[PDB]
Swiss-Prot record, chains A, B:
Protein name: Hyperosmolality-gated Ca2+ permeable channel 1.2
Gene giving rise to this polypeptide: OSCA1.2
Record carries keyword Transcription: no
Function: Acts as an osmosensitive calcium-permeable cation channel. Specifically conducts cations including Ca(2+), K(+) and Na(+) in vitro. Inactivation or closure of the channel is calcium-dependent. Mechanosensitive ion channel that converts mechanical stimuli into a flow of ions: activated in response to membrane stretch and poke.
Family: Belongs to the CSC1 (TC 1.A.17) family.
Regulation of catalytic or functional activity: Activated by hyperosmotic shock after mannitol or NaCl treatment. Activated by mechanical pressure: activated in response to membrane stretch and poke. Membrane lipids play a key role in mechanosensation by acting as a wall mainly formed by lipid head groups.
């Protein structure tokens, strides 16, 4: 159905161009310079044709970008570049060899002559149905081996480069209190001692000439909730006060906000005054209680040492016989710690993790039926009862094409909109004591969800819903035998899905619609002082847990569909290029970072790309040998083994630069620091970090 | 074929009893007290009815055995006890429920009335062929779940106990130079420095206040070979000199020993004098050369520290950016180091390891045809051409029974006799720089070999050789569908194989035939002095790499055959009991240890038992659901997952006590040692260890 592809591509390019026009119009207009240039503001550097921003997005090179925005953003942008590196040779090789036998005919050739312009959907000629044993299966074998070899080689080179950059940045990084501090989880209880005294004695005995001081984790979650509620009530009261200041003649106010006006709140100004005073008295009482409360001390501490060498020694070594006591690990920098999760006793994280696995299986299974709905809409919509007379205004062949190859993508994207938030809630629900770990776990869950459901349960539910349209429930019939002819029709679907969730999605991403609207509403209704406009600033992080699983999905989809239908790949390449440029601009100008963990997430990225390689190889094995092994099993059972072996080699050779901190690097950093600054007071620098944001 | 089982069991019990009679006769006879009591001699404690040795084998309890023979022997004996623990409840439950429905009828009942005395071979009633869906498949499901749960629980308890014993012993162990010494592999090269100076500077910079001294690895393999050849020539010359001293009238001697007298060596006394003098001059020249040879220094060293805390810190931490340089790990005690393997450059161990994998696949595949021969002999021997007239003296039904159920076991055991030596050569061929690691790797290879070949390629080659006796080579016929009816006939085979390689093998093991004969020959022909009789002593280690894979095989075989044919299990129980008692006696009286690595091999044992559990579950899944899944797949796909999860939990909870050395334990040991012995010279104690056995 190239007509659907063409109409959807046209409308998506038009949408992207319209988004860029509106973005330029809003950017040149100056009262919202405060939002489109959030950086240059948090770090003080600024105060206050159409699409030309891309050329100067490429300037200000990689070293200045690592120094400017941090190395996490640079490594994520390199994640986007890795897609181009992997899939441009693969696309060229597949288009030169696999469906087109046209390698080189013309060097400048504008219009293709009937080059799959009639019917490009049906590529199920020999990949699934007819066996040759002579040229086409061996073509598939050679293409699969070349694709795997190239992807592995570029993964190895990029993994080396990322490790080198991480080591150099960590060596050159300025002094921050997590280089000396180690978070000691699960301190064992004692009767006649406190947690602080236990930590003091243990780390004086077992790290004698290098231990400096410790700060104890205090459970102040109730006080933090009280403060958050007080801020919320302050904002609500300021909004109501300004609203009545606009119209002094106004009458009393409304009842409870969104519960259908369940209450009868009258003159909300006075009610909010009373609530704020009550919450302030409760906050003072809670502060005085928790400061002197001995049962608010959790069995954990932040121990700091006189040298990075000692901290690295402590963080990478077993501390006691029992590995479930004195859990020692690197501590996040104080802005990275997720304080709400430090109050979770270490015994109850495992049953919790099991609860996440149960709830995540429930989510990924129950969310099939909306993807089942998207696929039902992605099969020929024959029940016109939904739109029998007026689709919206009129029905037409273009209307069929739009409802067949634009509505599934939009529906799936809208159904995937609040999933990153749900997954963040599910990962935050169970202590990970750092924003970086929360983001990485949410990205891992989003990748598993996306792979298993959006791809697999879309292929299956576009296969078992189109071919097996109305049959019975037969069991012993070798069901996984029709997947070979099933998958490329889902390629036709995935062209549209990539286009919408890719080109248009990223084009609208730069518009910053939600931050712009929220900032304008807050500025108009809640300002109360011109100095709070900078407080209204929060561009947010790059969004690793919501942006990385998308690119991992597209990696897997391009890898899967390269040896079967190379029509997919150019759309993936366009996605990678556009996402790279847009997100580079965002890194330069917006998106301040919430944490700086120097590319500690890249082992996960490389592992997921390796898993995508393995999945692509296994699906190719299943799809090619539809019912006859075709003597390809003795060769498609070698690609997974060699890929796993190569992944093992890359693990063992490059992952230690991400999971272990060499002692020589620590000693060098300590020696250069102590030579550069000889009269440095480390104890006064490290003593009052890691206390709590609540206690000032 | 219970007749074969009965006759083979009778002959094997008779063989075991005869072995024990001869063992008692030889033990009571006193001129060979020097061999049957090798311990009490190497540690100076001694100088100089019938089967009653077992009662006093049980005395002298576990603490005194750990103090006396070492903890490796005690943990190996606990490996033997673990078999009883695992398989006595399993045997009782299976015999109470699975084939016999007789749980409790009589408490004292001598003779079984026609209780499977007619035909016990055919247990292929419902386990493979007929489906019930009502009582027997659910019986199998319940038995499999109970077996897995019990095995996992006892594995967890024993893993806890072994970890506790290891930690206590390591804490209480006396001072030995490997507690402070760390072997630094792959020292990077440098032009204007030596290896010694590089190690000195690096470990003065990066471990400043705790580094003591280093000893450099010198490649003295040629000198060691020269010394070994000199000892061999000394023994040969002493033998010839004593032989001519016995008969002075004798003439000149023979030519080259075993090459069909290829040479014409005359008067071997003078020729051996000349060879010994030449080799002595060459030894002196080689010593003088290698001492002052700068290219004989390998990029490795043995670095010693002032405290065990510092050594543990160094051995458990990354030392440099590159994880392929300054490889730091615990060093073996100087008697444990395999010096011949330290001369292997670290770049060439990986290609070597690949060579072992290639050669091991070649060995395990080429050695099928002798196991294929054993199975051909284990199928009905119908080609009487081998023994057409006289088998040995006469043919009889008992002769058929013996040649059917005694010759396969003996043939396979004889074919498995030199395999441990071959596997030791293959593991020693590629540097593992410690006898303990060599033994563990040889045991791992023997386990893989034994599992894949002796069990699997015996079941397959007793199936495809008996049922598919003379057919063609058909491919697309679902070959793995006859395994269900194949396996229990191989149970009939494995009863005999266990009996021979078990009861009789262990009964003959205590006889110490080879050590006795070698000691007597050496004493008679090579003594030359009465003080060399103690030098002629070498009982050898317990033989982990040759004794542990056998018990792992028997674990796997009992686990596999418990839910299909519980007739197997009592033979396994008898093997475990007899092996436990015999090897306990050997540990008490003989078998001095070559190394003391305190139960560092137990993670491997537990992992292999878990793998046997998983294999048993997968074979039960395949065998039960022969052609219909029988709704047992949704329940036999859960046992492997739960077993892997339990193994993961045991890993994460107990393996750190075996692979990591807690810093608190090191600090406590250091503090108690330095309080007990305040004027201890550590530098003088550690400076001249780890030099080489060749350089005195």
């Amino acid at each position: 159905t190239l007509q659907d592809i063409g109409v959807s591509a046209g409308i998506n390019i038009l949408s992207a161009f319209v988004f860029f026009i509106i973005f330029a119009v809003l950017r040149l207009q100056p009262f919202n310079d405060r939002v489109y240039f959030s950086k240059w503001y948090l770090k003080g550097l600024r105060s206050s044709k159409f699409l030309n921003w891309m050329p100067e997005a490429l300037k200000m090179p990689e070293p200045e970008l690592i120094d400017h925005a941090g190395l996490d953003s640079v490594v994520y942008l390199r994640i986007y570049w890795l897609g181009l590196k992997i899939f441009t040779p693969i696309a060229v090789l597949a288009w030169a060899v696999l469906v087109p036998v046209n390698w080189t005919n013309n060097t400048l050739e504008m219009a293709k002559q009937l080059r799959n312009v009639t019917s490009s959907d049906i590529d199920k000629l020999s990949v699934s149905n007819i066996p040759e044993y002579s040229m086409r299966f061996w073509t598939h074998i050679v293409m699969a081996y070349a694709f795997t070899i190239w992807t592995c080689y570029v993964l190895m080179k990029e993994y080396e480069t990322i490790a080198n950059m991480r080591l150099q940045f960590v060596a050159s990084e300025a002094r921050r209190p997590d280089q000396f501090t180690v978070l000691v989880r699960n301190v064992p209880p004692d009767a006649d001692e406190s947690v602080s005294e236990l930590v003091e004695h243990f780390f004086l005995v077992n790290h004698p000439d290098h231990y400096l001081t410790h700060q104890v984790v205090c459970n102040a979650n109730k006080l933090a909730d009280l403060v958050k509620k007080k801020k919320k009530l302050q904002n609500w009261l300021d909004y109501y006060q300004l609203k009545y200041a606009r119209n002094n003649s106004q009458r009393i106010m409304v009842k409870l906000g969104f519960l259908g006006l369940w209450g009868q709140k009258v003159d909300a100004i006075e009610h909010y005054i009373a609530e704020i005073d009550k919450i302030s008295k409760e906050i003072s009482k809670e502060r005085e209680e928790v400061v002197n409360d001995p049962k608010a001390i959790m069995p954990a501490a932040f121990v700091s040492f006189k040298t990075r060498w000692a901290a690295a020694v402590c963080a990478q070594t077993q501390q006691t016989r029992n590995p479930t006591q004195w859990l020692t690990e690197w501590a996040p920098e104080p802005r990275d710690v997720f304080w709400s999760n430090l109050a979770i006793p270490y015994v109850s994280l495992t049953v919790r993790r099991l609860i996440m696995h149960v709830a995540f299986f429930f989510l990924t299974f129950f969310f099939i039926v909306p993807i089942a709905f998207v696929q039902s809409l992605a099969t020929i919509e024959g029940i016109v009862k939904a739109a029998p007379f007026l689709k919206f205004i009129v029905d037409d062949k273009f209307m069929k094409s739009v409802i067949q190859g634009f509505l599934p993508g939009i529906a799936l994207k809208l159904f995937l909109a609040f999933l990153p938030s749900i997954l963040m809630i599910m990962s935050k629900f169970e202590g990970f004591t750092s924003i970086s770990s929360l983001e990485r776990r949410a990205a891992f869950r989003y990748y598993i969800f996306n792979l298993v459901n959006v791809f697999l349960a879309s292929v299956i539910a576009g296969a078992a819903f189109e071919q097996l349209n109305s049959f019975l429930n037969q069991s012993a019939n070798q069901i996984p035998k029709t997947i070979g002819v099933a998958i490329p029709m889902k390629a036709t679907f995935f062209i549209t899905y990539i286009m919408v969730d890719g080109w248009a999605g990223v084009a609208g991403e730069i518009l910053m619609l939600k931050p712009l609207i929220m900032f304008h509403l807050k500025n108009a209704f809640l300002v109360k002082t011109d100095k709070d406009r900078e407080e209204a600033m929060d561009p947010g992080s790059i969004g690793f847990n919501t942006g990385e699983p998308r690119i991992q999905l597209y990696f897997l989809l391009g890898l899967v569909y390269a040896p079967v239908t190379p029509m997919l790949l150019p759309f993936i390449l366009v996605f990678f290029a556009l996402a790279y440029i847009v997100y580079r601009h965002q890194i330069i100008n917006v998106y301040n970072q919430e944490y700086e963990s120097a590319a500690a997430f890249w082992p996960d990225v490389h592992g997921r790309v390796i898993a995508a390689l393995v999945i692509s190889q296994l699906l190719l094995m299943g799809l090619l040998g539809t019912k006859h092994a075709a003597l390809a099993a003795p060769f498609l059972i070698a690609l997974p083994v060699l890929t796993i072996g190569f992944h093992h080699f890359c693990k063992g050779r490059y992952e230690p630069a991400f999971i272990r901190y060499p002692l020589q690097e620590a000693m060098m950093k300590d020696t250069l620091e102590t030579a550069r600054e000889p009269n440095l007071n480390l104890k006064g620098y490290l003593q009052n970090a890691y206390v709590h944001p609540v206690f000032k």
